[PDB]
Nucleic acid binder design. Structure first.
Lengths: 100, 44, 195, 99, 66, 62, 38, 100, 123
RNA sequence: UCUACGAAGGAACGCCAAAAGCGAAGGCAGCUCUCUGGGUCCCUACCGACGCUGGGGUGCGAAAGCAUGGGGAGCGAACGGGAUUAGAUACCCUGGUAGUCCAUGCCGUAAACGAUGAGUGUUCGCCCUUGGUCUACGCAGAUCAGGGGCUCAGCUAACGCGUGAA
């Protein structure tokens, strides 16, 4: 039965536990998986996950990425004029920058 | 209320760490070759 | 009330859904639709009254039928009753067909009367009363053209182009009972009426 | 990535063969942090049609199963297999509801 | 398709032979695409016309179901 | 016969051979969704499965 | 029509087989027995 | 204008001379009804969910589910005693209809 | 058992018959042009195959085989092959006893399991 | 030629199969695996008006074409002959390179054609049908997303559409 833990880190494809983890870091209440900054962090880690393993020819998926990043620009563009404090928090903790 | 669904998902994911995989009926790899064991099913 | 009991016994309010109107349906029963039998009776009230009034000026009527299941029920009328012409009742037996009701003053002269009938009578029927499904359409069209009112039985099956240019609809809906005595009401009417 | 590896082998020749040949993968998957479950064979099976007319051996071929789960790249290790002698149609597919 | 001629029948043989083969669809293939050549344009167009043939003949049949 | 229902789903996998050899016809052709009584998802799964097995050399080709 | 022409060419298998005419196909009056069909 | 009022306006503005059905036409108007929307309601007898399943077994229950619903206010699964009563009535009725 | 095969290869304007052993050894051949005045404009007919099969029937009768799997391998309506097999039986039999049939019958028209850019259309 | 077995290769993927399906569009299919975009259903939890369109701009964009390096079975511009004709640059036959194919780049166009911009709400039905959901008791009924006909009406110079061309 010692083969429990030899079921980890290698029998793995999705590895979208990271989304859960960071969404947790940024989540206010519990089961609160749908707020703005939360989606921003999820997009962010998705972009950093996907800007690695695409072959400069999977052009459809690249377009997916492009739609991602610009919807993220929209997310932040609204984020900035509602809770500015949280928005400085956002940029500080997430490495994105401001351009009014 | 939806804490209930919280519980439901956590349970369905527990299932005794999935008893099916947690079973004692497993296969050691450093072993006497259950392959070699297979002489009955070798002609199955 | 008791008459509603009788209509309800008359296998009538229920008929399959082939509908353009819904002002009538009490509901449905998956193989039938139930129309509002009180509305049925009220339609009868209005139209039968209208015919019993038109009586008081004695204007020609000229029923129409083509589905010969009612043939006997109707033939008890229109001869010695209403129009009163049994010979015309024979036209009606074998009529509705040709150049009709608007080119009524057609020649039609050529008979060669071998196993044919070829009646062709001619006079403006100041009202029309029909009952069949659809082959008679010429009568409805031409009545609506020349401004002749019409009484007609309409089932759920009626295209708008009839359902809206026929006045006085008797939404009777003949159904599982098929053809049963109805016309005996209009038989009551116009006889022991004209005084 | 719970893969079932079917192995379509050449005829019965070399009994104490293919067992060690798959023992190679047994050590492979012991290593690399893999996991085996059950290695059921099926014995002789008549092939549909005359495969691999090189060396022939296309009627009554052997079949085994390995039923592992492991690292993804394992297919791009298994490409070690194809040119093996007795094996003809190594096929690592997936775990499905069907047994 | 294969058949042993049952004791020199050779006509009931061909009967079951054809019937089985034709029904197998394979006939609808060896009489099918063998011609000079067709591109995608002509291909789609002939598919469209096959559809219309079938819809017309099905109208005729559904009429002839009484 | 009785291999017509959704049971074929459980019993349709290129490892299995009898449930599927029931489908390839006389001359070695898959049979339509009409020739039997079976669904569209089904027929597509059967197509993948018969083509996988056939490529595996597990099923005939003529 | 059909029996006439078929039995005709089959008779003509005479001129196919024997050099031109050996009237061992004098036998061919059955084709006439079916040709006189009306 | 409508077939009933067109004609009245016509004769009143003196277009054509009067028809011989006018005095009676007005005296017997057409049977109008309140203008209602679509949705022919599916109307149901209250005793649906068991006749389907009982005629499966063996008309009279198609209405006797009423004589069962009458006590149905405290009916646990009295379907069994109902089908029993149906057995009783069928037994006696067929004894009679074989004695006839 | 052991038996010959007689193969018939319908084509556009030509067809052939080859009489061989079980393991493909050409013993007696005949081209639909191997007959007097049956090539040229004569090449495109079904009577071509008719005459070919009946002639090869007479020949493979002269040598009395009578146990020979006959195969047809071409692209046609089944009517052409029916007529050609009847012709072969004709030539085989009607210079011999009444019954001189085949031991077998079997069909083989290999389909191109894909495309190879069949040439363009005529105009 | 053919006839059996082989070998070499290339090229496309028979049947399924489909007015089926996926994509923003051009487009996409022998199979298996890794990675990967968008979708719909689903009690529904959050979140909160963040949406729609979009000038100048930004990517994608079949085929042919170009560049450099592969490969070249079959097809096959150019061209050769057989032809065919009053004549033949052609259609017909036989040869046949560039091209088709792969690698990366360049172009940036097609009847890129439902010849129908994008989006939102309201609209008589029936027939289907791809995949979800609920309800099932002889069997479907319901509900969503789509794809496809036929229609009430409405519109249209005319044809016709009616997932609009209301």
């Amino acid at each position: 039965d010692t083969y429990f833990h030899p079921d980890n880190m290698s029998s793995a494809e999705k590895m979208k536990i990271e989304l859960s983890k960071v969404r947790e870091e940024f989540k206010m209440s519990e089961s609160d998986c749908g707020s703005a900054r939360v989606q921003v962090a999820q997009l962010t880690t998705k972009i950093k996950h996907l800007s690695s393993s695409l072959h400069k020819k999977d052009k459809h998926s690249r377009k997916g990425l492009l739609g991602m990043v610009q919807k993220r620009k929209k997310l932040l563009k609204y984020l900035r004029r509602t809770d500015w404090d949280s928005y400085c928090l956002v940029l500080s903790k997430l490495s994105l920058r401001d351009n009014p | 209320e939806m804490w209930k669904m919280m519980g439901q998902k956590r349970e369905e994911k527990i299932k005794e760490r999935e008893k099916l995989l947690r079973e004692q009926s497993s296969l050691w790899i450093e072993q006497k070759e259950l392959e070699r064991k297979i002489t009955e099913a070798l002609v199955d | 009330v008791i008459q509603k009991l009788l209509n309800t016994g008359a296998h009538l309010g229920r008929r399959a859904a082939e509908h353009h109107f819904k002002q009538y349906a009490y509901g449905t029963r998956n193989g039938m639709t139930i129309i509002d039998s009180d509305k049925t009776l009220i339609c009868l009230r209005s139209a039968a009254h209208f015919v019993a009034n038109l009586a008081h000026m004695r204007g020609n009527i000229f029923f129409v039928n083509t589905n010969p299941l009612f043939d006997e029920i109707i033939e008890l009328t229109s001869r010695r009753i209403q129009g009163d012409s049994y010979n015309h009742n024979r036209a009606m037996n074998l009529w509705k067909m040709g150049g009709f009701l608007t080119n009524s003053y057609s020649p039609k002269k050529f008979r060669s009367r071998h196993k044919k009938l070829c009646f062709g009578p001619t006079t403006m029927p100041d009202c029309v009363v029909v009952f069949d499904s659809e082959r008679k359409s010429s009568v409805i069209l031409e009545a609506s053209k020349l401004q002749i009112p019409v009484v007609a039985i309409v089932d759920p099956n009626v295209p708008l182009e009839f359902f809206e240019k026929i006045t006085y609809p008797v939404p009777a809906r003949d159904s599982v009972k098929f053809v049963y005595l109805f016309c005996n009401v209009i038989t009551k009417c116009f006889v022991a009426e004209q005084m | 990535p719970l893969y079932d590896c079917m192995l379509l082998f050449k005829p019965i020749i070399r009994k104490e063969g293919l067992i060690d040949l798959v023992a190679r993968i047994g050590k492979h998957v012991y290593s690399r942090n893999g996991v085996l479950t059950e290695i059921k064979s099926f014995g002789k099976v008549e092939l549909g049609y005359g495969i691999r007319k090189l060396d022939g051996r296309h009627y009554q071929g052997q079949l085994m199963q390995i039923t592992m789960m492991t690292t993804p790249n394992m297919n791009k290790e298994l490409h070690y297999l194809n040119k093996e002698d007795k094996l003809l149609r190594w096929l690592l597919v997936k775990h499905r509801d069907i047994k | 398709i294969r058949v042993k001629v049952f004791s020199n029948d050779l006509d009931k043989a061909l009967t079951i032979l054809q019937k089985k083969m034709q029904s197998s669809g394979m006939e609808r293939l060896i009489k099918g695409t063998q011609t000079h050549h067709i591109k995608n344009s002509e291909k789609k167009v002939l598919a469209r016309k096959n559809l219309e043939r079938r819809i017309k003949s099905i109208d005729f049949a559904r009429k002839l179901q009484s | 016969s009785e291999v017509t229902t959704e049971e074929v789903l459980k019993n349709a996998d290129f490892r299995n051979v009898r449930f599927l050899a029931n489908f390839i016809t006389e001359a070695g052709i898959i049979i339509k969704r009409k020739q039997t009584g079976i669904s569209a998802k089904a027929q597509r799964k059967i197509a993948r499965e018969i083509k996988t097995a056939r490529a595996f050399g597990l099923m005939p080709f003529t | 029509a059909k029996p006439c022409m078929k039995e005709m060419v089959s008779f003509l298998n005479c001129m196919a087989l024997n050099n031109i005419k050996d009237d061992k196909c004098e036998k061919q009056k059955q084709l006439l027995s079916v040709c006189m069909q009306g | 204008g409508d077939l009933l009022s067109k004609t009245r306006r016509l004769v009143g503005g003196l277009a054509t001379r009067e028809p011989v059905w006018l005095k009676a036409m007005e005296a017997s108007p057409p049977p109008v009804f309140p203008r209602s929307n679509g949705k022919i309601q599916k109307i149901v007898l209250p005793e649906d969910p068991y006749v389907r399943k009982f005629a499966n077994k063996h008309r009279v229950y198609g209405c006797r589910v009423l004589e069962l619903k009458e006590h149905g206010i405290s009916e646990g699964d009295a379907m069994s005693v109902a089908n029993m009563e149906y057995l009783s009535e069928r037994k006696e009725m067929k004894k009679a209809y074989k004695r006839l | 058992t052991n038996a010959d095969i007689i193969h018939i290869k319908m084509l556009r304007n030509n067809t052939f018959v080859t009489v061989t052993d079980s393991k493909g050894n050409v013993k007696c051949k005949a081209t639909s042009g191997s007959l007097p005045d049956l090539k040229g404009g004569r090449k495109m007919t079904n009577y071509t195959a008719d005459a070919t099969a009946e002639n090869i029937g007479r020949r493979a009768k002269a040598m009395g085989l009578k146990s020979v799997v006959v195969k047809v391998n071409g692209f046609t309506h089944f009517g052409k092959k029916k007529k050609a097999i009847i012709a072969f039986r004709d030539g085989f039999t009607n210079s011999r006893s009444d019954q001189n049939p085949i031991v077998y019958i079997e069909d083989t028209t290999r389909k191109a399991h894909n495309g190879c850019r069949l040439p363009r259309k005529r105009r």
